[PDB]
């Protein structure tokens, strides 16, 4: 289903936050940076001027990068699902609810 | 209803400080007098920490006088633009400016 998108997007941020961020000897925990990222995903999901602010320097660009990509993912999958909702998919159990919410 | 007593206002401020801001159902389960929409409206009207409940000056009066003629209706649109953002102090200031200039 959609789970591979989630697993891929979290692990790629994990790989990038392993490689960069600390730049020497830092790596501020782990779940914490992913939690700030998840809150940022909800913040861009908020359709608002609610935005993840007051952060680190280059972690900001990484957060923005994966955020815009997950937003592109949501927009793409949702637009295709609504187009499939026209008369292509002919079928939904919970897909109807998910597409209505996202649209 | 909605008398907005002081002991209820302190409990609403403590619930907004403890539970959160985007959780209106969690704050309405500890007051037993108002609903969640009424509690959110009270928190956005009088219990907001950024609300300027005093210090009515001549610059804000000249800003509101130079805005009520450009837009006669939609006082809620000019609430955050004037700086009051209470959605009822603007109408009260307009009524005071209309009654004081009438004699």
């Amino acid at each position: 289903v959609e789970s591979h998108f989630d697993l891929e997007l979290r692990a790629a941020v994990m790989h990038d936050i392993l490689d960069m961020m600390p730049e020497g000897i830092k790596q501020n925990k782990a779940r914490t940076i992913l939690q700030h990222l998840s809150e940022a995903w909800r913040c861009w999901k908020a359709n608002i001027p609610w935005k993840v602010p007051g952060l680190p320097t280059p972690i900001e660009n990484m957060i923005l990068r994966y955020v815009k990509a997950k937003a592109d993912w949501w927009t793409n999958t949702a637009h295709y699902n609504r187009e499939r909702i026209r008369r292509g998919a002919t079928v939904d159990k919970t897909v109807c609810k998910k597409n209505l919410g996202r649209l | 209803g909605g008398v907005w007593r002081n002991t209820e206002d302190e409990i609403l401020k403590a619930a907004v400080m403890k539970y959160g801001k985007n959780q209106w159902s969690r704050i309405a389960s500890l007051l037993h007098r108002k609903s969640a929409k009424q509690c959110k409206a009270r928190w956005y009207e009088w219990l907001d920490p950024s609300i300027k409940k005093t210090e009515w000056s001549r610059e804000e009066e000249e800003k509101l006088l130079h805005l009520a003629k450009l837009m006669p209706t939609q006082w809620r649109t000019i609430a955050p633009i004037i700086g009051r953002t209470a959605a009822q102090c603007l109408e009260h200031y307009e009524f005071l400016l209309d009654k004081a200039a009438q004699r």
Binding site: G24, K29, T32, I33, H36, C43, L55 | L70
Partner: peptide, 28 residues
């Protein structure tokens, strides 16, 4: 390079002269 805390989740000029110029013209 330190991660700060993250607790936010629930768990231009804003004026144009054309609107005022339209409102004064409508009043006139």
């Amino acid at each position: 390079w330190k991660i700060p805390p993250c607790i936010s989740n629930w768990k231009t000029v804003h004026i144009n002269e054309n609107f005022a110029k339209l409102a004064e013209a409508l009043y006139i």
